[PDB]
Amino acid sequence: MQIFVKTLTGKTITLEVEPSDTIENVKAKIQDKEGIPPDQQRLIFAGKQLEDGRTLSDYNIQKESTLHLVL
Amino acid sequence: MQIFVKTLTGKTITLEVEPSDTIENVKAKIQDKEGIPPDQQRLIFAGKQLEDGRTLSDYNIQKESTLHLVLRL
Amino acid sequence: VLFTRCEKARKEKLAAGYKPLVDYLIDCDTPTFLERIEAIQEWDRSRDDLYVWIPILDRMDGLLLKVAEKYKYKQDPKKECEVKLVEMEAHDVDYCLKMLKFTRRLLLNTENRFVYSSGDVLMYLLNCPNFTIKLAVMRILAILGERFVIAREKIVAHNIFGDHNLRKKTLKLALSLSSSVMDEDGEHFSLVDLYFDKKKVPQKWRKLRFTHYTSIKKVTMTTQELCEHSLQQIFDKGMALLPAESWFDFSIKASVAKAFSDDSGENIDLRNIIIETKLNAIAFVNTIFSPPQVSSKLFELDPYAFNSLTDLIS
Amino acid sequence: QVKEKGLINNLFDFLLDADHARILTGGDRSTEYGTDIDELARHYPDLKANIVEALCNVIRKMPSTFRNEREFLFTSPKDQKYFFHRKNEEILTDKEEHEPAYWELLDKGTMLDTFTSVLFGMSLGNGSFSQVPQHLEARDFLAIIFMENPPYEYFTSVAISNVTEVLQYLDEKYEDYAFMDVMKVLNDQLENLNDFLNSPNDRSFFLERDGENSVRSCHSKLCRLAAILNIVTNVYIDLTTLSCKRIMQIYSYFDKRGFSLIKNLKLLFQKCALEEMYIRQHMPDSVITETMPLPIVDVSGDGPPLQIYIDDPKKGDQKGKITSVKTRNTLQMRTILYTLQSNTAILFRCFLRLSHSRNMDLEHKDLTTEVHIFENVVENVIEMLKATELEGHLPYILVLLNFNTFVFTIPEILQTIPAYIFYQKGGYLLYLHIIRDLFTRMTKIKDLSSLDNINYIDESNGILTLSCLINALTFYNKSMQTETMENVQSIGKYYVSIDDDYNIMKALTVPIKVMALAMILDLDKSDSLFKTQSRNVPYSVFKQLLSMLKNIFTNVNIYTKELYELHWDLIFPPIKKISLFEQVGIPGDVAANYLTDTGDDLPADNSIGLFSPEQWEKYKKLIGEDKSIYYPQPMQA
Amino acid sequence: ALKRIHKELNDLARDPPAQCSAGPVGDDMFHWQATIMGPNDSPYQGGVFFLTIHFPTDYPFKPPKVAFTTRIYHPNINSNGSICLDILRSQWSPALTISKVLLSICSLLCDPNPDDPLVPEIARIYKTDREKYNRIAREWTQKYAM
């Protein structure tokens, strides 16, 4: 399903993910769309930083969710 | 037909729906009457949640049937 | 207390409905006012807001002061002079009790009691050597402060709990007697046993032995001497051999000894009064001290308090 | 059953009863009740019409329940006079509460508190309340807010706060629902006070009329006006609330209703300051300090009117020691006057700011209206300053100077265009004359050591003179440094028939410097400022003069051969020529097009042929002997 | 207050401000964690700041308690996280929303209030030396906010 990712320091994009996908996979997709490696990407949602080891299901991230990127 | 929705954190509301109506229509009407976005809405009937793709007739929801509304994050 | 304009207007409008009652207890002379307040025992209505009773309380607070100053119990901050251990006349004792008991009853049957503002009158009267007045004041103080622990905050309008002098006096009162003692024979004796014939009063409680450090001032009084001397005589004796600061403490211990010196009706009544004052002091200190502070100050020093309390309520 | 039986009507009808309204407490509980009614409307859209109809019906019915409950001003038993008359009088010293509290004890008071809390809750709901503008004209909504004969404390009450929230919500949603109506209400209220505003300026209106019912009537009018002004300044006209639509609405109002409002506000502030001064001159000092109006709930004290204490204000606890009927009446009067003055000053500052808040682009009509408003406000301020002589009115003059400084500044940097109009009308020359007179008066002061220890402002002549002189010198200094002036564009924005385009701020900076330097030289010629053998001037005054010298000798990169008077009707395309053409018969659009094409030049002959024969005759007849009044003219020395 | 907090969170979710984000902590809707990004052209620009918000049982009739969990340099912000803001102290109204509070805090970040500060030292160094205040704020943000 589709997800919304706004770059606070850049532009906004949309991605496709699955509930089981880890935040590391999301960061890898962000790198593919932009280029910055996951280590430098900072992911924020609902006022809490997103951890690579976790996943969307653990964070309860739903469809059309809007996340924030700091780079 | 008329159904009831009980908000565990409030009062009960009434919805005018039909058996063929999908759960998405019910969620939209619940948002209209309450203002909660449909994605934040979780509906429970007889202890089981409801899938947006299915219809009321699929879940065997009939006239006067009372659903429960909960929110999950 | 400070009320917002809307709150003050609402309170005034509410009190406007109690005007006949206020005129009933305010348009009468002092003896009639006393005989009228003493006739108010049961509440046939919901708990009245204490604000509507402000005119009455002040009047009572006016009279109590006249008795506090008459015996000089009012401690003057301008003077380092202490308070003499002088008993109150029985007439004055009844006069003060008639109003203190009514204050207890009123505080029991009212809410929004933060408006209660007498405060210092109770502090002054606590210095009275007579133990009935001490019991009444301790009862009123214990009913208060219970709100201050239920809410733990909020304007209170007396704030007497902060003072360290009152804390020290209350701790001394709560430690009067011991919930359990080891008699000479070695058999445990708890204060509850005072109401059963299966045991005898320990000889330790029957004799007075007070020691204070300035160089060590000692007052010793045997059972026979305590029986011969009156309570005021004992206070006079101790006052002549001890520094001022210790007098209050002595006034407790002596009063305890004289209570247990003989098994007379007056002595038994004084025993009951002292025990009730001890329980009320425990209740009060439980509300103006942190749990660890209470354990370190009272329960560790008096371990058998809980067992006696449980045994006394059946 | 609910719809037929009208239970929704019963949900509101009980709010017209004082007992139920008081029970609802008019706070939190009433807001929750309003939100609950809004949620009831939301859950059953079928009931929205009934709920709105019931709300409108109760709003319409509420004014009928108002009545003259009681009186707020009481004559003194000893002399049957409301206010003191001599500084040596005596005080009855009653035991009553020092400050009266009437509003919450009135039936309509608590009723309005509760009803406005309910309305605030419904607005918080953001549901059915959005439909009250329909089938309820604002002329009826305002009928409950601005009731006749309110208490002196009405403008500072929970009802007014809730009404402010509700009106802010409505203004944000419906921009033009009520602004015109409230402005009309304010103007009509000011008109009703014509007797009080136009009274002689040499004596106190109230003290002259003391002992008559006219005092009570005027005080009730002033209380209503104070409530109106508080609402206007808090909701509609505020520097923070000045939106583009708001500025356009103000322009439209002043275009289609005239400028009588500005004159009425000038008169209001002038008379309020005069009343405060005169009243303070007939009360014992103890009452003066006992009736200071400054500690109002939510004023903060900043801004005019300036407060002249008698005891140091950093001590506190100065109020409530002594009370009496006259003392309470004086307290009410002073509170009302203070709030009126403060709100009038805020309104004048907002009027002088207007579009420059947003820097939005303006059409010719909007620019002309803005400059007209500036001209009216500045001329009214100058008239206010000129009205009263400086002898014996030092407190009033100090308040006036503080008001002028506050009005001509941005929350501070000078407002360049209003200040330019101020200079063109002779305001700075008046300030110079006042400064010289105050300097001569200061030279008469017996000693100056005390003047250097000014922990606060008193009624002493020396300290008042020092404060007035310092205020005037500070205002003069702020108009000479380009760092503290709004950087408005050059005069080319306004005129085309000019010799040279010059930056308005820098061009204005020159004449002020010339006047200040001439004044300093004249003072030197008197052997006062310099050449003295003793410290004949306090430190602050000499520091201000040194700053003036430093600014005067600072350089600005313009030459400013001469300055052109700024007139609203002469802004290109000038309204005078357009109006003349309209009188002739030509449409305004054609006149504007011709003026733009010909570069602001009158048609000497009909060779262009756009004037009809009779039109040409009328044009030649109506021009007048002088054609110089249709072009900007240089400003005289 | 639950009906109010629900709609506040819904409003934030529908059109969240890109400057800040917030949500419940441990599903306790009365406890919220919020994120703020330093305002542009400010010494704190580019940083991330965490805040803890507690909603009183009588919300919105009383202001929420907002504390800066992350260390920050500002005249009106104390190291313990306490905030000195008008809307949270005296200018609170039920009409205000948490999003408006976050926007006001973000504006205050680049618009301090030296005349009425919380920690005197920061206000004094700000008034005496603007450049030194900017430098120290930048260093603190780099140390902690980044």
- Residue D536 has a CB neighbour count (10 Å cut-off) of 13
Q: Which own/partner pairs from D67-73 qualify as long-range (CB within 8 Å, at least 24 positions apart)?
A: D67/D108, D68/D149, D69/D106, D69/D107, D69/D108, D70/D102, D70/D106, D71/D216, D72/D100, D72/D102, D72/D151, D72/D152, D72/D216, D72/D219, D72/D332, D73/D215, D73/D216, D73/D219, D73/D329, D73/D332
Does residue D197 sit in helix, strand or coil?
A: helix
Listed by number, the residues of chain C in 73-92 with a beta carbon closer than 8 Å to a beta carbon of chain D are none
Distance, CA of A17 to CA of A57 (rounded, Å)? 11
Could you tell me if A34 and A5 are in contact, meaning their C-beta atoms sit under 8 angstroms apart?
no
Q: Cβ contact (<8 Å) for C5 and D25?
A: no
Does residue B42 sit in helix, strand or coil?
A: strand
Contacts of C78 (CB under 8 A, 6+ apart): none
CATH code of the domain made up of B1-73: 3.10.20.90
Distance, CA of B4 to CA of B14 (rounded, Å)? 5
Does residue D588 sit in helix, strand or coil?
A: helix
CA dihedral A13, A14, A19, A20 (to 10 degrees): -60
Query: A11 — contact with chain E (CB < 8 Å)?
Result: no
Distance, CA of C175 to CA of C294 (rounded, Å)? 12
Closest CA to D300 of E86, E82, E111, E114: E86
- Residue C189 has a CB neighbour count (10 Å cut-off) of 20
Amino acid identity at D597: D
Token reading at D158: 């929970």
CATH code of the domain made up of A1-71: 3.10.20.90
Give the distance, in angstroms, between the CA of residue E124 and the centroid of all CA atoms in the same chain: 21
Closest CA to C194 of C274, C124, C116: C274
Token reading at E33: 């964690």
Residues in chain A: 71
What is the distance in angstroms between the Cα of D583 and the nearest Cα belonging to chain E? 53
- Interface A-B, measured as beta-carbon pairs within 8 A, has a size of 6
Burial class of residue D595 (count of CB atoms within 10 Å of its CB; 0-12, 13-18, 19+): buried
Q: Cβ contact (<8 Å) for A46 and E24?
A: yes
CA dihedral D159, D162, D165, D167 (to 10 degrees): -50
Phi-psi region of D531 (alpha: psi -120 to 50; beta: other; left: phi over 0): left
Parallel, antiparallel, or unpaired: how do β-strands B66-71 and C48-49 relate? unpaired
Strand order across the E65-68 sheet = E20-25, E28-37, E48-54, E65-68
Token reading at D307: 């407060």
Q: In the CATH hierarchy, which top-level class contains the domain E1-146?
A: alpha beta
Token reading at A65: 């969710």
C-alpha atoms less than 13 angstroms from C-alpha of A8 in its C-beta half-sphere = 26
Q: What are phi and psi of D495, to 5 degrees?
A: -125, 155
Contacts of E40 (CB under 8 A, 6+ apart): none
Distance, CA of D98 to CA of D88 (rounded, Å)? 21
Find the chain B residues whose C-beta atoms sit closer than 8 A to any C-beta of A: 39, 72-73
Domain boundaries, chain B: 1-73
Closest CA to D126 of E58, E7, B9: E7
Which alpha helices (DSSP H) does D408-479 contain, by range?
Answer: 416-424, 427-443, 461-478
What is the distance in angstroms between the Cα of C164 and the nearest Cα belonging to chain D? 29
Task: Mutation target for D interface from E7, E10, E61: give the one with most D CBs within 10 A.
Answer: E61
Give the distance, in angstroms, between the CA of residue C240 and the centroid of all CA atoms in the same chain: 25
Amino acid identity at C310: T
Largest CA distance in chain A: 28
Could you tell me if C158 and C284 are in contact, meaning their C-beta atoms sit under 8 angstroms apart?
no
Q: Residue for token digits 């996340």?
A: A67
Chains D and B touch (3+ CB pairs under 8 A): yes
Distance, CA of E57 to CA of E65 (rounded, Å)? 12
Which alpha helices (DSSP H) does chain C contain, by range?
Answer: 5-16, 19-26, 30-37, 54-70, 90-108, 120-125, 131-150, 164-174, 203-206, 223-228, 231-239, 247-261, 265-285, 291-294, 305-312
Helix (H) or strand (E) run with residue D192 in it: helix D179-192
Q: How far is CA D373 from CA B70, C109, D494, in A?
A: 59, 67, 15
Amino acid identity at D425: K
Task: Mutation target for C interface from D23, D28, D104: give the one with most C CBs within 10 A.
Answer: D104
Does residue D94 sit in helix, strand or coil?
A: coil
Helix (H) or strand (E) run with residue B14 in it: strand B12-16
Active site residue E20: no
Closest CA to D34 of D155, D137, D119: D119
CA-CA-CA-CA torsion sign (D531, D532, D533, D535): negative
Token reading at E141: 């943000």
Which of chain D's residues have a Cβ under 8 Å away from the Cβ of E94?
31, 120, 124
From first CA to last CA, the distance across chain E in angstroms is: 35
Could you tell me if D552 and D474 are in contact, meaning their C-beta atoms sit under 8 angstroms apart?
no
Distance, CA of C162 to CA of A20 (rounded, Å)? 59
Could you tell me if D117 and D31 are in contact, meaning their C-beta atoms sit under 8 angstroms apart?
yes
Which alpha helices (DSSP H) does chain E contain, by range?
Answer: 2-14, 86-89, 98-110, 120-128, 130-140
Q: Residue for token digits 């800066």?
A: E68
